[PDB]
Ligand SMILES: NC(=O)c1ccc[n+]([C@@H]2O[C@H](COP(=O)([O-])OP(=O)(O)OC[C@H]3O[C@@H](n4cnc5c(N)ncnc54)[C@H](O)[C@@H]3O)[C@@H](O)[C@H]2O)c1
């Protein structure tokens with residue numbers, strides 16, 4: 001790969017390759033931006049096609065977080081750690097003890113947490129070497145509650161009222177998040193239509209909150225007024241968009257849009273898309289509140305705020321006549337840049353999340 | 357395939373650093389921090405391709421690990437490679453940015469000058485961090501020390517091949533009269549030695565002929581000159597299949613890096629009875645100086661660790677017989693043994709532990 005060219009393109013800050021032989025650790029800490037403060041991003045551990053793909057993923061996801069964290073109104077930049085390995089096989093104490101040290105070797109530029117293929121017990125070993133790590137002491141139900149709120153503000157644009165009574169919701173997946181979402185939804189007298197590749201998981205959902213069950217590859221064309229992807233990404237492509245009955249999309253899934261283009265057209269069909277990385281923010285917003293020093297109430301109230309973040313993204317989608325994801329991209333950028341100026345005053349006793 | 361190369365020689369980190377406003381593209385390679393903070397200079401050169409820049413970084417860092425170890429420093433191996441034309445691409449912003457990234461490593465990496473970086477460069481880096489050495493406005497020389505470093509290294513080499521550590525009456529082929537080579541000659545001449553000097557700057561040669569009553573040879577010829585010691589103080593890979601059979605001296609000892617063009621050239625020189633003072637043990641003087649800058653500079657103690665080079669070569673010479681292996685291999689093992697020996701002897705717990713950073 002031609003790394004530095006990619007870095008100078010989106011003005012990434014650092015890509016930190018870490019290797020301990022005794023453990024066999026091969027980790028890439030990508031840091032895109034630290035303007036708002038320490039880069040927060042999880043440790044992903046997956047088996048990769050090739051080293052080139054691992055580096056690509058790292059950078060992709062970090063540049064991601066920069067925007068999630070910005071829009072969620074956190075004081076944190078964008079980063080993500082990718083370990084190359086089979087989480088089922090290649091993990092050790094040494095592995096996480098080593099990475100921990102490398103993370104303290106960055107002295108607060110990077111803060112990690114769990115992602116795909118890392119337990120808490122993992123972070124707990126990392127915690128032995130450093131405090132630049134979160135999600136160890138009291139995340140799916142919060143993410144889910146995050147959507148519950150996000151859905152309402154989305155409903156209020158395309159529906160006129162933030163009430164969900166009479167609205168039909170197609171809930172794709174009954175995963176850890178989706179399950180907890182449903183509870184909250186149908187207990188406001190909306191109508192739930194559920195689907196999943198684990199059919200027993202579906203049955204729990206139909207039985208508990210009176211949903212209709214549908215085959216995985218039907219959920220799009222179901223007569224429904226809102227769509228909630230909580231299983232798979234790139235679920236909003238040329239094949240599913242014309243199948244779609246709903247006038248509102250809002251779910252937990254990442255990369256809901258298969259290409260940038262699909263957002264642009266959905267806008268012009270009158271369909272109101274709550275952008276992925278604004279909604280699922282709930283989970284991050286929680287581990288983020290862990291660092292300031294956890295408070296259950298205040299934590300949830302910044303999660304509750306997702307409503308208003310969507311509402312503002314919705315507003316700008318009209319006020320500028322652009323797809324909701326583009327408004328969201330700009331909401332973040334505007335924040336990052338606005339503070340960059342407003343904070344460029346000197347203090348010798350400066351304050352950040354690390355000064356807890 | 358980076359990670360494979362890293363896991364091969366158990367490198368620790370490769371830190372890619374980029375600030376767009378300055379255009380900085382820097383690779384801080386860190387091979388080992390066993391003995392403590394990795395010390396290594398910032399090189400700034402124009403590179404064929406990004407692949408070659410990463411390769412260089414790793415090469416040079418893995419280098420320092422061993423130089424620092426053998427020189428008896430409490431420092432690991434690192435090197436920073438900026439991709440750029442030092443003549444064109446430099447800015448305050450560039451070095452202000454890199455400085456921050458270096459403080460972003462909080463004492464794992466300590467930088468200094470190398471090819472394509474001024475002190476004024478380090479002075480801008482110093483604005484952002486103290487993990488940096490060779491600051492002249494504040495302080496080394498540092499060429500004459502490197503040179504004195506060789507003077508001592510050459511003596512122990514002479515005593516092995518030639519029988520006495522005196523250089524009186526010995527003829528010395530000094531390839532290059534650079535800033536180091538000159539000051540080496542200064543010591544040599546004033547110990548009753550005889551110099552055969554060569555250089556692409558013919559005025560630099562004239563200074564040497566005039567000041568040390570020295571002989572001169574055309575650049576191409578310095579190898580086959582009838583002389584007792586060969587001292588490469590200009591270019592590396594000067595000990596290749598071309599020059600080794602041309603070589604009349606029984607001792608090689610100079611300031612130049614990568615004196616051996618390939619590993620094998622060391623192996624054969626051993627069996628010809630030529631006594632090679634290995635590059636990274638002899639020229640250590642310069643590092644050993646900026647290294648003493650951090651503990652807090654002390655002219656006497658600084659030089660006395662440089663003086664020690666005599667004994668480091670002598671030990672490398674000893675092991676070259678006691679195990680029957682080329683002097684560079686003995687040097688590689690001298691370092692390894694030290695790194696590993698201390699790794700054990702220091703694995704006792706202290707909460708109030710002491711390192712060069714706790715000066
Ligand atoms: N957990 C969080 O905080 C969070 C935040 C960001 C990411 N996400 C996103 O949300 C999901 C993770 O939530 P989770 O951990 O609760 O879910 P999960 O991984 O526990 O469950 C996902 C469900 O998707 C179903 N599924 C897979 N393919 C399907 C298909 N083609 N059609 C229908 N169902 C299918 C599976 O059967 C499974 O039950 C992912 O899409 C992820 O990208 C969640």
Ligand SMILES: NC(=O)c1ccc[n+]([C@@H]2O[C@H](COP(=O)([O-])OP(=O)(O)OC[C@H]3O[C@@H](n4cnc5c(N)ncnc54)[C@H](O)[C@@H]3O)[C@@H](O)[C@H]2O)c1
Nearest residue numbers: 499502532534535536555556557575590611612613639642
């Ligand atoms: N200065 C130090 O502390 C130090 C320590 C480590 C590295 N070195 C080594 O020393 C070498 C130079 O030391 P310096 O910085 O004192 O020198 P310098 O750069 O000040 O001078 C180099 C000299 O080499 C001569 N030269 C170049 N190519 C030549 C050739 N083909 N034939 C003959 N002469 C030639 C030039 O005319 C010039 O006078 C470097 O190549 C490096 O390997 C020096």
